Amino acid sequence: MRAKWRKKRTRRLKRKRRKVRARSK
Amino acid sequence: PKKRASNGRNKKGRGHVKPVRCVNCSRSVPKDKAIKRMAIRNIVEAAAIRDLSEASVYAEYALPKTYNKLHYCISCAIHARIVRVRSRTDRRIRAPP
Amino acid sequence: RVVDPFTRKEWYDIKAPSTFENRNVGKTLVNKSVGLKNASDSLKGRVVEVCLADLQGSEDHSFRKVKLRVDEVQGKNLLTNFHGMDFTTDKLRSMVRKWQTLIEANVTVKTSDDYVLRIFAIAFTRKQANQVKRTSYAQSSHIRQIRKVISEILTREVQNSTLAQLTSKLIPEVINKEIENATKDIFPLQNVHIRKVKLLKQPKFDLGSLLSLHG
Amino acid sequence: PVTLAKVIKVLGRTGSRGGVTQVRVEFLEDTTRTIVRNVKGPVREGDILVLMESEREARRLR
Amino acid sequence: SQVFGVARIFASFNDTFVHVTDLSGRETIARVTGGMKVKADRDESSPYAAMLAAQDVAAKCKEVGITAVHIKIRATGGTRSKTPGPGGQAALRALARSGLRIGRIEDVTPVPSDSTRKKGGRRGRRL
Amino acid sequence: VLVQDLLHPTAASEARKHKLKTLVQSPRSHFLDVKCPGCLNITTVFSHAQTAVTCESCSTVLCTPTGGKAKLSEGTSFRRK
RNA sequence: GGUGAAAUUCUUGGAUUUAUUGAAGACUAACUACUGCGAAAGCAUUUGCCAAGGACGUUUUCAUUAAUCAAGAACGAAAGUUAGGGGAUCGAAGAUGAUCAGAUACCGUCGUAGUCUUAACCAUAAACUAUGCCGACUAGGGAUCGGGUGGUGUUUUUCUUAUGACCCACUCGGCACCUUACGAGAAAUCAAAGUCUUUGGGUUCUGGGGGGAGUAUGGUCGCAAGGCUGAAACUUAAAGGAAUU
Ligand SMILES: [Mg+2]
Ligand SMILES: [Mg+2]
Ligand SMILES: [Mg+2]
Ligand SMILES: [Mg+2]
Ligand SMILES: [Mg+2]
Ligand SMILES: [Mg+2]
Ligand SMILES: [Mg+2]
Ligand SMILES: [Mg+2]
Ligand SMILES: [Mg+2]
Ligand SMILES: [Mg+2]
Ligand SMILES: [Mg+2]
Ligand SMILES: [Mg+2]
Ligand SMILES: [Mg+2]
Ligand SMILES: [Mg+2]
Ligand SMILES: [Mg+2]
Ligand SMILES: [Mg+2]
Ligand SMILES: [Mg+2]
Ligand SMILES: [Zn+2]
Ligand SMILES: [Zn+2]
What we know:
The structure is cut from a larger assembly and holds chains A, B, C, D, E and F. Chain A contains 1 helix and no strands. Chain A has one helix spanning 3-24. Chain B is mostly beta strands. In chain B, 5% of the residues lie in helices and 14% in strands. Chain B has 1 helix and 4 strands. Chain B has one helix at residues 50-54, and strands at residues 19-21, 28-30, 39-42, 65-68. Chain B is elongated and about 60 Å long. Chain D has a 4-stranded antiparallel sheet, with no helix packed on it. Chain D has one domain: CATH 2.40.50.140. Chain D contains no helices and 4 strands. The B-E interface holds B 21-28, 39, 43-45, 48, 51-52, 55-58, 61, 64, 66, 68, 70, 76 and E 2, 68, 73, 81-84, 89, 92-93, 96-97, 99-107, 118-120, 122-127. Bound molecules: magnesium ion (17 copies) and zinc ion (ZN) (2 copies). One zinc ion binds at residues 22, 24-25, 27, 72-73, 75-76 of chain B. One zinc ion binds next to loops of chain B. Chain C binds one RNA strand through residues 45-47, 69, 92-93, 96-106, 124-125, 128-135, 137-140, 142, 144, 147-148, 184-188. Chain E: Keywords: Ribonucleoprotein, Ribosomal protein. Chain E: Belongs to the universal ribosomal protein uS11 family.
């Protein structure tokens, strides 16, 4: 598996998490 | 391991230079990995000269020649094309043959 | 309906200025003169490209092209004026080999007889006799100096008597020779070619000037 | 239209499947022309080869 | 002695043109597009088609007045290929052997002084 | 290379090496007394003169400093002393 | 038109093509190399200017003024974000023809952001020569690039020097090579990756099985996107390097 893709996925997940946190706030 | 002491090609005391688009695949390739065969060819075929000489206005005019510098990039430098693949032993030969 | 363009086409013959050793150059085949849109105002802005080795006969000028614009319309005849002394694409490229430095001088000039012209000078360093150095380069500042000298020479040559004299000078390449003579004392140089000439601005139509290039 | 040329030398044999010969054809009407021709089948030197094609020529077969 | 025409061969990698012009170039004599003669699209870059087109042009022109011909050749470029493709040489041959006299062959391919970003997109065309 | 005397160097070998790299660090420069065509007496000029030089009373250029050495104008006679 | 095939789209409106010019915006081919420059990233129309810089010269001057450096800073490709201009080209999304078992993937056609700028930010790259930097020395050979020296050196001629371009001899500085090992390597390879068991020339900075992981938590820097910093639980006996058949 490619690492760049994995990194991208992780970033996306992080973004999602951030959004969730914001919503909670 | 590194296949070459030159790693890629030519970028020594330089770095991060200028790109060329290829002949057939037209892809962005550095002006070192570029591979430049350089084609010198007379406009007609080798057998299609006598006939021209026979039927022309300007008798004994000779030939014009095309000078086309090819940028046949590493990737599409090989199909049945030039440069081939050399043995890891006999790769340290910079000669034109 | 018949759409064949041979009945509605006129066969004119092209005459070159008195600067060239050959009077007639070719046969322009335009349009048979029909009332409204006549073959006189239809021409003018039509430029014929032709070599010098036919216009002189000498095969020393086998390279380089000459552009001639229509300026004089006569009865079943067209007389032309000079426009663009250009270069053959195959010869300039044959001059360009690896190792030797290409020096390009580019000069904008104004004629004494009121015309805006553009002259290019393509020069090359030469691997002269007894040179072990396989490569044959210049020294950048030297190139600049050469260019400056060429510009000076161009300034000297132009601004002095019409286009008709300039064209004549071009014809057996005297300018090139003079440049070589001048620049031999800075950097060797082979070829030293005038390549391309571009005319930009034409103020008046005139008649006398047109006449003077025929006879 | 009918043309015919004698063969003199064979420029090997080319084809993906193979078999088809590359020949050097010389015209018995004016020997000034020696053309590269595609010939199907067994062919030697000094044979009269009829040609329905007049001027078209090809080398490699792929 | 002879009537001179200008051939202007546009035998790009796909299709041939034998667009025979005047001497200024403003008025065309005959064109006959290379891919018209054969209605097989595989046979457009083919030399045979080009040859046929050239022959047709010769028929139009040699049997009307024009006997001598300067030949300009360009197989596109600038951003495209900058290289003579299949069909130019064949056309030239046809012109020669139909019976027309040759008035100096020359190549006028549009060669840029570095151009716009050409097609492919960095990684380029994938075969 | 077994033994080389790095204390008695030959007159050619030393010349081959530059200035400071020799066993005794000494200048290669010999600065000269000049005999210009105008004046009647000797004047000192450095071989690598840096700036413009005048002879005695009249402002006469002796040497034009370009690169390393000095371009001695016209043609004058000179000794190492 | 287009490709390995065709098919989209444009068309008796004259498309395409052939001239001429004009319009615009980027881009500076061929010369272009085992070459230059720069702290890197970078940089290629010329000529004007405005400063800077190495290298070389140097019987100059100063006199240890130094080397590397956590802090903190200055730059830092491209994409991306803000505005304003510009908007040819190529072209993420987006359409649309195909190909396909299935293409929203490669191929073909158009096409808003963006590319290019003037102001900001951002601070990452396989920012790679994957070789921290400054030193010192050990091996031979040419070849360049830059500046110097000596040629009773050669054609350059305007008589003759004087230049400049050449040729040999040297060096000095730089990018690099080629040849060996006599060293060092785990080897592949290396004139440094050598002087490293005979192990301390100076210094910064990193790593301690693979994964979880550059993740979770904090902190900060950011308009945002993100970057800097950076775990553990658990989890396995391998992951990996170079070579070999
Ligand atoms: Mg550098
Ligand atoms: Mg495209
Ligand atoms: Mg412009
Ligand atoms: Mg350029
Ligand atoms: Mg250079
Ligand atoms: Mg940008
Ligand atoms: Mg589909
Ligand atoms: Mg898509
Ligand atoms: Mg696409
Ligand atoms: Mg468009
Ligand atoms: Mg990093
Ligand atoms: Mg790193
Ligand atoms: Mg002499
Ligand atoms: Mg010099
Ligand atoms: Mg671990
Ligand atoms: Mg965090
Ligand atoms: Mg393993
Ligand atoms: Zn390629
Ligand atoms: Zn005096």
